Amino acid sequence: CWFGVFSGHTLGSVISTDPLKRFFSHTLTQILTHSPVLKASDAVQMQREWSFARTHPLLTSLYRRLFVMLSAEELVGHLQEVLETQEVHWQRVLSFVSALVVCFPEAQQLLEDWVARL
């Protein structure tokens, strides 16, 4: 029901999308930042378990929703920014990129761009 209200059909209709975007940005950073456990750089084999279909459908649905109510290259810059700035929960970031690549219209080359910069 929490993810249900988060789906921004009821909410987008009433709320101006300046503070809604700040809410989503803080929400995304707070998903990524909070509890940076499994920081093990050997979080390699766990990529198979953080594969998109094995990551819970709830995470997947909310990630799709967060993609719907926002823009793509905004998300790419924000991700680049936060991963550079602050520590990570690798579970949610790997799931998140796994949802990013297949959800958004061909941003695997936009991924390769900042991968090359990094």
Binding site: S13, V14, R64, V68, V102, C103
Partner: protein, 61 residues
């Protein structure tokens, strides 16, 4: 009540397929009935009359 009546007239590869469907749902659509606006602006006008009358008793005194 103007804005509430309006905010009720406003409500009414597989991942990519459903992403596009939800894009189509949230496509910038505005439905602010002019006639509703009109209805409410007359109800409002009746009260503006009352508030304006009441400000003359106050700004006189």
């Amino acid at each position: 009540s103007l804005s509430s009546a309006i905010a009720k007239h406003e409500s009414n590869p597989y991942r990519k397929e459903l992403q596009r469907e939800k894009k189509k749902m949230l496509q910038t659509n505005l439905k602010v009935s002019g006639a509703l606006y009109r209805e409410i602006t007359l109800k409002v006008a009746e009260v503006q009359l009352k508030s304006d009358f009441a400000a003359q008793k106050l700004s006189n005194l």
